[PDB]
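Regression test attached.
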Amino acid sequence: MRKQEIIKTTEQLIEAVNNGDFEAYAKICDPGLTSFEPEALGNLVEGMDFHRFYFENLKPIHTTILNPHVHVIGEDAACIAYIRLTQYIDGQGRPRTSQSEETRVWHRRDGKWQNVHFHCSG
Amino acid sequence: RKQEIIKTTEQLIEAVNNGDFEAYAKICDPGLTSFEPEALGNLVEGMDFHRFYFENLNSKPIHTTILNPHVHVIGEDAACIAYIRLTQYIDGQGRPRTSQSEETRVWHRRDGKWQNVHFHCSGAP
Amino acid sequence: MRKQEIIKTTEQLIEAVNNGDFEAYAKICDPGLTSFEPEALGNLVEGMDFHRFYFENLKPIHTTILNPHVHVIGEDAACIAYIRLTQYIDGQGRPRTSQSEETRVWHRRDGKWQNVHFHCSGAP
Amino acid sequence: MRKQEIIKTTEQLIEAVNNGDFEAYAKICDPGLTSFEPEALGNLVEGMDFHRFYFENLLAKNSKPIHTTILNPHVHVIGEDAACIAYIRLTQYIDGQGRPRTSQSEETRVWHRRDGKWQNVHFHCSG
Amino acid sequence: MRKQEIIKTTEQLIEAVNNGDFEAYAKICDPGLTSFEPEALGNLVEGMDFHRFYFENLKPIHTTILNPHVHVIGEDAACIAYIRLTQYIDGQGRPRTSQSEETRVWHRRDGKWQNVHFHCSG
Amino acid sequence: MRKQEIIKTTEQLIEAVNNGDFEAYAKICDPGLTSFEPEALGNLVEGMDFHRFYFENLLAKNSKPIHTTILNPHVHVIGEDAACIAYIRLTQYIDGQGRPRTSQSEETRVWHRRDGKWQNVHFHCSGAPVAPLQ
Amino acid sequence: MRKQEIIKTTEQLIEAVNNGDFEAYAKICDPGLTSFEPEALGNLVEGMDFHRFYFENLKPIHTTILNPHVHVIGEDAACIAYIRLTQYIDGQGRPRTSQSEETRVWHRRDGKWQNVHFHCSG
Amino acid sequence: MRKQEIIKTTEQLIEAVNNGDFEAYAKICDPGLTSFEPEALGNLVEGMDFHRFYFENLLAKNSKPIHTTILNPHVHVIGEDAACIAYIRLTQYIDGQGRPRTSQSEETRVWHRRDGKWQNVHFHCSGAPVAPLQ
Amino acid sequence: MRKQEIIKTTEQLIEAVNNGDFEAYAKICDPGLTSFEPEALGNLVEGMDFHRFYFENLKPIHTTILNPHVHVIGEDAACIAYIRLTQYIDGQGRPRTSQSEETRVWHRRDGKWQNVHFHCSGAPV
Amino acid sequence: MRKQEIIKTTEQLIEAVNNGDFEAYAKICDPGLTSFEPEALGNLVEGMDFHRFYFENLKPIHTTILNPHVHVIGEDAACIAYIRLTQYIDGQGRPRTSQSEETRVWHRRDGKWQNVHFHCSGAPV
Amino acid sequence: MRKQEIIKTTEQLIEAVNNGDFEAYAKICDPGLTSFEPEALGNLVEGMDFHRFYFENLKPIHTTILNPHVHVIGEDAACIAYIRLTQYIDGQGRPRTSQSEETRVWHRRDGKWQNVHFHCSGAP
Amino acid sequence: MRKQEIIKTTEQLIEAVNNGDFEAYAKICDPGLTSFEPEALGNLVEGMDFHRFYFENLLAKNSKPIHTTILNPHVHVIGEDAACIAYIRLTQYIDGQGRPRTSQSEETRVWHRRDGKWQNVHFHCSG
Amino acid sequence: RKQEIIKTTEQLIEAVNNGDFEAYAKICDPGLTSFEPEALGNLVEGMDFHRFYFENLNSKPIHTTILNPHVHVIGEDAACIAYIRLTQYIDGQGRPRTSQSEETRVWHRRDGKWQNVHFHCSGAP
Amino acid sequence: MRKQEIIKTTEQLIEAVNNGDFEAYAKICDPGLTSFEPEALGNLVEGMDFHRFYFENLKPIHTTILNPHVHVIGEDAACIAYIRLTQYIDGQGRPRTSQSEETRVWHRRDGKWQNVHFHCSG
C-alpha cells in the first residue's frame, strides 16, 4: 500500500533533476549514492560529485513513469524498477520521445527516504 | 555481512554458467523482476523468462571476473550489490573475446537464506 | 446506421487533434484512454497525460480516412479500423503523403461515445 | 474477475497459432475477423481467409523452440458482451544461424461474447 | 472520329491541372472519381477531396501525350491509356523530363464526358 | 447486383493466371487487350502476345503455393455493356529461400460485355508483379 | 505497303541474332555496316567484324517491337526507329525484361534490303 | 564530294541549336522529324514540338560559352535523295560552378533531299544531352 | 596511509593540467618525465618539452578518478593506476564524458614526490 | 648496468608469454600484479587470474623491443617503457606486424625482480 | 600508301602480344623501346625487359583498331595514334569490351620498321 | 646535343600553355596536331581547334601560382627532321580551399622539324 | 662528430619552419635529391621543387620533436641520420593535432661545412 | 663511373631477398643495419633481427630498378635512391605491379660494400 510512498519520492527526485535544483536532488539522494548510467561509460560512480556537473552547466519536456514495480524489504528498505519515457523537442525543432529502464534502491534514514543506488540503461 | 552477499551473487552466476536451473531458482525469489538486454527494455517477471536460456543449452571455455563489487546493506534483511562483470570467452570463429556488463542485484533475506528479488544488466549479455 | 455514428465521432476526434483543441479532444476520449503509438516507443500509455504535451507545445494538411470498417457489439460498444492518409508540406517545400493504420475502440458512457483504446502503426 | 477471462482466451488463441492448430484458431476468432498486421502491408484484411495460408504452408512455429510472454495486459470491459485487450508480446526463439533472439510486438485484440464463448472480431499487431 | 473526342477531353483535363484551375478540373471529373496514384501510397482514393490539396497549395512546363490508345464501348463509355512526358525546370535551374503511364476511364453523363477512374504510375 | 458480376470475372481471370491456364485467360481477355505493367518498363503492350511468355515458362519447376486477396474492389458501371474495377491485390507466396512473403499491387481492369460474357480490354498494374514465375 | 516490307526485314534480322545464325545476319546486313551500341563504349564500329564475336561465343526469350516508325526516301532508301522489349530468364532463374531504343537505316542493293547503319541505346 | 555536303548541313543544324535559333533549326529539320534522345526517357518523339521547349527556355540567363567538335563523321549515301551520318559529338562547355567540362554524345542523323536542300527526318542521340540549357 | 599521499599528489597534478598552470605541473613532474599518450602517436616522449605546447596554446570540466590502486616499493618509490572520467561540454554545446586509463610512477626526491613516468590510453584529456 | 638487469627480466617475461609457459610467467610476476590492457576493456584487473585464460586456451612470431627506457628508484624499485613490435602470420596466410606501447613497474622481492604493474596500449599480443 | 605500311606493322605487333609470341614481338620492337602504360604505375620503362614477364608467365578475345591516324616524317620516321577496343569474356562468363588509347612511334632501321616508343592509357 | 634542343622546345610549349599565350602555342604546334588527353574523353582530336577553347575562356593557369617540373625526359631522335619525347610532368599548385597540391601526368610529344623550327604533330597525356 | 650532424639537421628543419629559403639552400647541396609525399613517389632534384613551398607562405604555432636520431658515420667526410619527426600544430578547425614522419638525411662535408645531398621522408608532410 | 659498382650490389641484395637466401643478404648488409619501412609501422629497427622473420617463414616475380641516382662521398661511402617496380601474380590469379621508393646508404668495409641504412616507402 505504502509502495506509493516510494513512487512519489522517485517522482520528486526526477522533478528536481528536470528543474536543475541540485539542493533538492541532494536532499533525496544518500551522500554515498552509487550509480551505473550511460554517461559513466560502464563504470560505477560515487554519484554525488559526478552528477553536480550536469546541474552547474545546464526547453519543454514531460517525463512519464510506466509500470513502476516496487519490492518492499522490512521497515527501512525498498527498490523500484520503472520505464522512463521523456517527451522533448530536438534542436532541429521536431518533437522526440526517448526510453530509459531505471532501478532505484531506497533506504529510510530517519523519517525521510534516501536513494542509495541508481541503475539507468538507454 | 557484505562478503555474505558477494558469495551468493558468485554462487548465482556459477549456476547460470553451468545451466543448473534448479540451483538458480533456489537463490532467486520466485517473483524476481529483471531489466536486461534480451528483454528489449521491458521489465520481466524473470523466472519464466529465464528458463528458455537454460532449457536450450561451460561447454565452451569461459572465465567470469567481478570487479569493484560495492554492497549497500539496509538493516537485518536487505542489501543491494553493483559490480562490473568481465566475461572472457572464445567466439565461433576461434578468436578469444572479452565483454563487459554492469549488473545490479537487490537481495532480501527470507528465513536464513538470501533471495535475489531484482536484477538490472546493461552492456553485453 | 449506427456505424456512421462512430465514423463521425472518429472524424470529430481527428479534427480536434489537427486544431490543437485539447478541451474538444478530452470530451471525446475516456479519461482512462490507453494508447499504442509510434511516439510511445512500443509502450502502452495511460494516454490522456501523455498526449497533453503535443497540444500545449505545438501548416496546411488534409487528413483522409479510407475503408473505415466498424464492428458493433451490443448497445454500448463498437471498434473502428481505418487507414489515415495525411497530405502535408515538408520544410523543403515539397508536398508529401504519409499512411497510418489506426484502431479506435469506443464505449458509450451516458448518451455520448468515448474513445477508451487507440492503436496507431506507420507514420505519426 | 471477467478481465482474467479475456487474458486466458487471448493466451489460448496465441497457443493455437504457435501449434499450427487452425481448427482451434477458427473456434476462437469470429468468422468476420478484421486484422491490421505487418504481413498485410498496411491493409485491413477479412483475416480468416488471409491467415489460413500461414497454417497450411508452415510447420508449427512450436516445431522450432519458442517461448511467448505477455507483458502488462490491460483489459477494457464494456457491458456483458464486449471487451478489448492491449499487451506487449515478447517472443524468445532461435535464428537459423543458431543464436537466440527476442522480438517485441504491440497487440490489440477486440472481443465479442457470442453465446457463452468469446470471439476475436478485430486484431491490430505492430512490430 | 469519337476516339479523337476522348484525347481532346484528356488534354483539356491535363491543361486544367497544369493551370491550377480546380473549377475546370471538377467540371471534367465525375464527382465520384476514384484514383490510384503515387501520392496515395498504393491506396484507392475518392479522388475529388484528395486532389483539392494539390490545387489550393500550388513556372514553364510542356506535357506530351505519346501513343494514346482509346477503347470505345457503346454510346456512353470509353477508356484511354497513354504515356505522359513532362518537360519542366527543377528549382536548381536545370531542365528535367519525367514519364508517367496513365489510364483514364470516361463515362458520358448528359452531353459532356466525365472522368470516373484514374490510374497513374511513375 | 451487376457489380458482383465484375468482381467474380476479375477473380476468375486472376485464378487462370495463378494456374498457368493460358486458354482460360484468353477466353476472359479481349484479343486486343492493352496493358501498362511493371514488366513492360512503362510501355503500353498489345498484351495477349506479351503475356504468353509468363505462362509458357511457368513449369512444375516454378509451382510455389500462393493465395491472392482482392481488397476494397470499387466498380464503376457505364451503361449496359461497360464497367471498370480498381482493387488492391495482396499476394501471399513462398520465396525460393523457403520464407513466406506478401506483395501488394494496385490494379485497374476495364471490361466490355461481348454477348453475355465479360471481356477485359485494358489492364493497369503498379507495385509488385505477382504472376507465378515472378 | 513498302513500310511493312522494312518491319519484316528488321524482324528477320533480330530473329537471326536471337538464333546465333551469323550467315543469316550477314545476308541482311551490308558488308560496310557501321554501328553505335553499348558494347562499343561510345565508338562507331565497322560492325561486321565486331559482331562475329557475339555469335561465335554464344534459353527462352521473346522480343517485342513497339511503335515501329518507318521513314521511306525514294525507291531504294528507308530508316526504322523502334523500342525493343526483350523478355528473358536470368541465370539466377528469375524472368527479366530489358528495353533498347534502336535505329536501323536500310539501302535496297539488288532486289533485297541491306542494313547499312545501326544505333542502339539501353 | 556529296558526303561533305551532309557534314556541312549537320554542322549548320548543331550551330542553330547552340545559338537557340529555332527558325534556323526548323528550316533544316523535316516537319515530321522523329527522335530517340536521353531527354525523352527511351521514347520516340515527333520531335519538332518536343524540341521547342529547349529553345524557348534558353535565355541570356543560360548563354554559357561552348564549342562542339564532330569526330570521325561516317556518311552512308543511298541513291540521289537519301543519306545518313553517324558521328561522335564532343561538347566543351563551362559549368555554373565556373569549371570547364567536356561531354560525349554518339549521334545518328538520317537525311532526305527535298528540292535542292537537305532535311533531317530522324535523329538518334546516346550519352550526354548537349543542348545549351543542359 | 602513505598510499593516500600519492592519490593527493596525482590529484594535484591533474588540477594543474586542468588550470593550465605549467609552473605547478613542472614542480610535481621530474624534469626527465617519460610519457606514452595518444597525442604522441605511439612514441615515448621526454615529456616536459612535448607537454609545454598544450599549456602555451590553451570551458567547464569535472575530472573523476575511479578505483585508484597504489603499489608502494620501499621508502622512495610508488606507482598509481586509475581510470580518469572527464565530463566536459563539446563546442556543439552538448555534454560529453570520456574515459582514460592512466599509470603514473612516482619517485620521492628530497621530501616532495616527483612523477617520472606516465602511460595514458583511451581519450586525450 | 642495473638497467640492463630489468630489460633482461622484461625479455624473459615476454618469452614466457610467447611460449605459453604460465609457471615461468607467474615466477616473474608478483602475485598481486595489476594490469591495464586492451583485452580488459578499459578496466584494471588483478591480473594473475585474468591472464590464466589466455595460457590455458592457446604459429611463428618474432617480438622486437624498441628504445627501452628504464627509470631506477633506489635499491628495490624500477619501471621500463618500450614499444613492442610483433611480427606474426595471420590465419589468411599473410605476414603482419602490430605495435604495442608497454609500461612494466618492477619490485625486487629478495634477490629476484617481480612485475607488480603492467600498462599496454595499441594491439593485444 | 606508306601509312597503310605502319597500320599493318602495328596490327602484326598486337597479333604477337595476343599470341604470347615474344620472339615475334622483339623482332618488331626496337631493343631500346620506352613505354608509358597502366601496368607501369605512371613510370617510363625500358620496356623490353619489363614486357617479358607478361609473356613468360601467361581465352577468346577480338582486338579492333579504330580511326588509326598516322603522321609520316621523312623517309625513316612515323607515329600512329588509335583506339584499341578489346572484346573478351570475364571469369563470371559475361562478354565485356574495354577501350585503350594507344600511341606507337616507329623508326625504319634497315628495311624493317621498329617500335621505339609506346604510350597506352585506359584499360590494359 | 640535338636531344637538349627538343626538351627546350617542349619546355617553351608548356610555358605558352601556363601563360595562356595561344599565339606562342600555335607557332610551336603543327596545324594538324592530333591529341589523346583526359579532356577529350578517350577520343583523338585534330587538336588546334579543340585547344583554343581552354585559352579563350580561362585566365592563364599562371594567374594562380603553379610550378611545372619535367622528370626523366627521354628523347628518341630519328634522322635530321624527326624526334619524340616522353616525360613525367609534376605540377605544384594551390587548390581553391587554400591547401597546396601536386599532380602527375605522363606525356608523349612527337616532333617534326619543318624549315628550321620544330613543330609538335602528336601529343598523348594520361593522368 | 655524431652530435655535429644532429645540430645541422636541427638547423635545416629550423630554416624550413621559418620559411628562410636562403638559410635552407646554404645547408643543402645544390644537387639535393628527395623522395617525399608531395612528389608522388618520384625522385626530385629537390632545390627547384622545394622553392614553391617557401615562396607561397611559424605564423601558426608548431613544435617539432626529433626522436631516437641514429647517425651512421663513414670516414672523414660522410654521414647519414635517421629520425622520427613529431610535429605538434593547430588545425584550421582550431583543434591541436600531432603528425609523425620518418626522415633519412645523407650528409657530405664539402670544405668545412656539412651539406645535405639526399632526403627521404615517409608518413605525414 | 664506379656508380655502377653500387647499383650491382643493390641488385645483388634485392636478388637475395627475392630468393629467401638470408646468408647472402647478411653478407651484403652491415650487422648494425638501421631500417625505416612500412612493415615497421613508422619505427627505426636494428634491421638484421627484424628481417630474419620474413626469410624463415617464406610464386613468379620480376623486380625493376628505375632511374637509380648514386651520390658518391670519398673512397668508402655512397648512397643510392631508386624506384622499385615489382611485377607479381596475386592469389586471385591476376598479374599486378607495385611501386616502392627506396634509399640505401653504403659503407665499404674492407674490399666489399655493406648496406648500413635502408628507407622504403610504398
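Expected vs. actual: identical. Helices of chain F lie at 3-19, 22-28, 49-56.
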